Amino acid sequence: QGHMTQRLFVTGLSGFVGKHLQAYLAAAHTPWALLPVPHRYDLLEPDSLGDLWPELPDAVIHLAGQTYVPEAFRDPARTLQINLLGTLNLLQALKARGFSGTFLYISSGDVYGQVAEAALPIHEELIPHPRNPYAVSKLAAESLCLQWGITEGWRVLVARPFNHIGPGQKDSFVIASAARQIARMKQGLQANRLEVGDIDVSRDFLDVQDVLSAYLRLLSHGEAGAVYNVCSGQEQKIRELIELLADIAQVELEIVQDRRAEQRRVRGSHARLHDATGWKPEITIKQSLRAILSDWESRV
């Protein structure tokens, strides 16, 4: 009956993506059985990691870390400690326990930095040029994890996801903030006015569920030692997404000016991930935007 089951441990289960992954694994038919977390742990504290795996994971997805760019600029050392030294502490704890399975490190499409429009769509052979300490720490942790795969013989995979859309996303993202505010307009809690910065840029978006499905297909099919973009391959203009949110919400609003963005356009290539795994995006942008508006209605 069903799948040959494998034990999966996920760090960061309490964060934005983690909560969606736990729900995904509870509802879907998958070979991955999510291991329980025996107690709270801190990646900065090796003694808190010791007994996390009464049953040994066959695979690990490492989501946990300091994920806010302004916080990384505020305290770069702490972001490096959490994202790089924390990853090292996790790797060493897994090693001491006897782990030798699949380790999928979750990086970010932000490692690429400034990319010329002529180099679009971004592919994994483009040399990255991180522009903030968070992106620096992600690229450094990528290298570390892949070095561990070389040194220890583990199956190490790296994913570079681009823009995510989902309930629970950081309010500092313009699309998440726009949805929150529009849901407040629906309920008469704020005027039909949106104060924006530069929204005449395009970015590559995926629903969080398509991002999750890419990670699980990487666990099933990815090549040891390889880096994969996780992206839609489609540019969306921020302004058109805001207009579609208003349309879905049955609201009319004015967008009012609250410095131009450095990177005007971002399109990623997911050819490598699709060729290796069969993965394809399945959630439409309209469904993604409706989902975040609906989530906000029950919270505002």
Ligand X SMILES: NC(=O)C1=CN([C@@H]2O[C@H](COP(=O)(O)OP(=O)(O)OC[C@H]3O[C@@H](n4cnc5c(N)ncnc54)[C@H](OP(=O)(O)O)[C@@H]3O)[C@@H](O)[C@H]2O)C=CC1
CA nearest to 10, candidates 41, 36, 47: 36
Determine, following the binding rule CB under 6 A, whether residue 16 of this chain makes contact with ligand X: yes
Indicate which of ligand X, a copy of itself, none lies near residue 101 (CB less than 5 to 8 Å, by partner kind): none
Residue 268 DSSP label: B
**Which phi-psi region, left, alpha or beta, contains residue 265 (left: φ > 0; alpha: ψ -120 to 50)?**
beta
Determine, following the binding rule CB under 6 A, whether residue 161 of this chain makes contact with ligand X: yes
Question: Least distance from C-beta 262 to a copy of itself, angstroms?
Answer: 9
Distance of CA 39 to the CA centre of its chain: 24
Determine, following the binding rule CB under 8 A, whether residue 34 of this chain makes contact with a copy of itself: no
Q: Where are the alpha helices (DSSP H) in the chain?
A: 16-27, 69-74, 76-80, 86-97, 133-152, 174-186, 208-221, 238-249, 271-277, 285-297
Residue linked to tokens 């504290």: 45
> Half-sphere exposure (CA, 13 Å, Cβ side) for 70?
3
Number of residues that bind a copy of itself (CB under 8 A): 29
Question: Which of the ranges 3-11, 85-93, 156-164, 264-272 carries the binding residues for a copy of itself, by CB under 8 A?
Answer: 85-93
Determine, following the binding rule CB under 8 A, whether residue 76 of this chain makes contact with a copy of itself: yes
Question: Least distance from C-beta 140 to a copy of itself, angstroms?
Answer: 4
Question: Where does this chain bind a copy of itself (CB under 8 A)?
Answer: 73, 76-77, 80-81, 84-85, 88-89, 92, 113, 125, 127-133, 135-136, 139-140, 143-144, 146-147, 150-151
Question: Where does this chain bind ligand X (CB under 6 A)?
Answer: 12, 14-18, 41-44, 63-67, 82, 86, 106, 108, 161, 164, 169
